[PDB]
């Protein structure tokens, strides 16, 4: 799959495709890889278990609960539980979460990464997404949503594991 987050001006987005693959066949084509959390204040995307995500997004949203809402802290506190607990440690998936403050990547390896210009591109198509998301953010005035989306379509074109079904979320401030 491919998830692409971009942040320009007062907008930050997270777009993802809808293909779910098994072997060499497409299982589903309209999977919802992006969603809103923490009273719509937080937007996130996931690459992997359509349920593993569920479990994760919630716990994450449990971190933001009694930690004011500090995106970064609750994010590192999550990867912490994630890499520890046998339960959490069991599930595998790439997490891409953003918010007014900043966007970052969370992984099972208890890793909390924040790409260069808050530009995230995970999933089997992340590279393609990023290469295109770059060429644009670099030589274009296009909005965060226009790049995320245009970059996402480019990925879908190259990546055999990503389709052109989008699911975008945004955040304005």
């Amino acid at each position: 799959t491919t998830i692409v987050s971009v942040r320009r001006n007062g907008h930050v987005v997270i777009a993802g495709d809808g293909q779910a693959t098994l072997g060499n066949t497409v299982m589903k084509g309209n999977v919802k890889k992006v969603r809103r959390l923490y009273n719509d204040k937080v937007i996130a995307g996931f690459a992997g278990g359509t349920a593993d995500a569920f479990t994760l997004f919630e716990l994450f949203e449990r971190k933001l609960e009694m930690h004011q809402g500090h995106l970064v802290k609750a994010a590192v506190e999550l990867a912490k539980d994630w890499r520890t607990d046998r339960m959490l440690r069991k599930l595998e998936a790439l997490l891409a979460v953003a918010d007014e403050t900043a966007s970052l990547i969370i992984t099972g390896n208890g890793d909390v990464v924040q790409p260069e210009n808050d530009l995230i591109a995970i999933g089997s198509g992340g590279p393609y997404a990023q290469a295109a998301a770059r060429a644009l953010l670099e030589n274009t005035e296009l909005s965060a949503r226009e790049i995320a989306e245009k970059a996402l379509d480019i990925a879908g074109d190259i990546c055999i594991y990503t389709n052109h079904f989008h699911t975008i979320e945004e955040l304005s401030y």
Partner: protein, 393 residues
């Protein structure tokens, strides 16, 4: 003839800064208890307390509100940590202890409340026991019926000569702890408390959110939710075995409190959600908020400090810029390290005043002035050194 909500909020304003909604909330609870007493027997049974759930960050007013509310209603009050009971999966303790602990405090009250409302009469009759071992013209009559009757004459000048003047004083106190007791009725006193608990009890349950779900694990959620289950009867209406009697939780007012950063009130057990009909949020405090807390409350910390120092014959004065400076510090530390709400003020205010607090007795008669200069000199360094902050502030 109780106060109206606006009246209740007002009084609350005298101690708590901001958090208006929470006040109106906790205020409607109180008023409703009055409202209920004003109905027919039938309805008086059907109308139960409108229990409240406060949602908000640490030290921003939750408990203070509940505490002041209870105070204003002269109601027995008790605070309790929800997670305390999840421990029962090892040994912990049982929820019924809440009503039990509540009653015990409800007794300690009715007691001190009644004994104090007596220490004055017992002292007066006490002297009437001493002013009897100095001039005993007891019995009926003695001299005249009118003029000569009044035996006070020498006695009067005798008691005064003693009041302002074994050992009278040593004797009276002994008589005080003999007449007071010989005046208390421990029967109705035991039931007095129970009635309180049953009609004005206020139970504060902190960490309600820590008793919720989370895809965590079977074991833990089972321990957590159990505390919720064990809470149901208290809140739904039941009877508890009191070391001093039998209490009906039926009309006790419950004020639960949760951050809900991790968990949402909707994760709470259904039965509970039903019994927490009122939801209210409290906001994080602002530096401005802080400045007001430091001074506005009528027994503010700043006022306390000034008083404490006066004790030592030292006059303290807080400049506005001084207060502002103090407030910013607390905020700065809370943001740079860990946000603990208004609590931070006490730590800061207290570190700031150390040198004086110590030298106090020596500056007897001086006019110290804590202005922005002083504050900065004393706190700026500490506030800056983060690691030092996590120890000293």
């Amino acid at each position: 003839s109780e106060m109206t909500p606006r009246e209740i909020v007002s009084e609350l304003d005298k101690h708590i800064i901001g958090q208006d909604n929470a006040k109106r909330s906790v205020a409607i609870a109180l008023r409703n208890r009055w409202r209920r007493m004003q109905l027919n027997e039938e309805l008086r049974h059907e109308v139960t307390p409108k229990n409240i759930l406060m949602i908000g960050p640490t030290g921003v007013g939750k408990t203070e509100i509940a505490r002041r509310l209870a105070k204003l209603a002269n109601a027995p009050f008790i605070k309790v940590e929800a997670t305390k009971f999840t421990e029962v999966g090892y040994v912990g303790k049982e929820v019924d202890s809440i009503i039990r602990d509540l009653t015990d405090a409800a007794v300690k009250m009715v007691r001190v409340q009644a004994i104090e409302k007596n220490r004055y009469r017992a002292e007066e009759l006490a002297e009437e026991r001493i002013l009897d071992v100095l001039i005993p013209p007891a019995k009926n009559n003695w001299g005249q019926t009118e003029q000569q009757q009044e035996p006070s004459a020498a006695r009067q000048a005798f008691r005064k000569k003693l009041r302002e003047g074994l050992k009278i004083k040593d004797a009276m106190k002994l008589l005080i702890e003999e007449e007071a007791a010989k005046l208390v009725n421990p029967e109705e006193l035991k039931q007095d408390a129970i009635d309180a608990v049953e009609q004005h009890g206020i139970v504060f349950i902190d960490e309600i959110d820590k008793i919720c779900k989370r895809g965590e694990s079977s074991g833990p959620d089972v321990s957590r939710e159990g505390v919720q289950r064990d809470l149901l009867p208290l809140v739904e209406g039941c009877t508890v075995s009191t070391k001093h009697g039998m209490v009906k939780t039926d009309h006790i007012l419950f004020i639960a409190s949760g951050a809900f950063q991790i968990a949402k009130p909707s994760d709470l057990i259904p039965e509970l959600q039903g019994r927490l009909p009122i939801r209210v949020e409290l906001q994080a405090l602002t530096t401005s908020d802080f400045e007001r807390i430091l001074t506005e409350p009528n027994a503010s910390i700043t006022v306390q400090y000034k008083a404490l120092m006066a004790t030592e014959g030292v006059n303290i004065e807080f400049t506005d810029s001084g207060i502002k400076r103090i407030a910013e510090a607390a905020w700065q530390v809370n943001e740079s390290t860990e946000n603990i709400g208004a609590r931070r003020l006490h730590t800061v205010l207290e570190r700031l005043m150390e040198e004086i607090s110590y030298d106090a007795s020596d500056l007897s008669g001086q006019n110290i002035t804590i202005d922005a200069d002083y504050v900065s000199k004393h706190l700026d360094a500490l506030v800056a050194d983060e690691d030092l902050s996590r120890f000293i502030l």
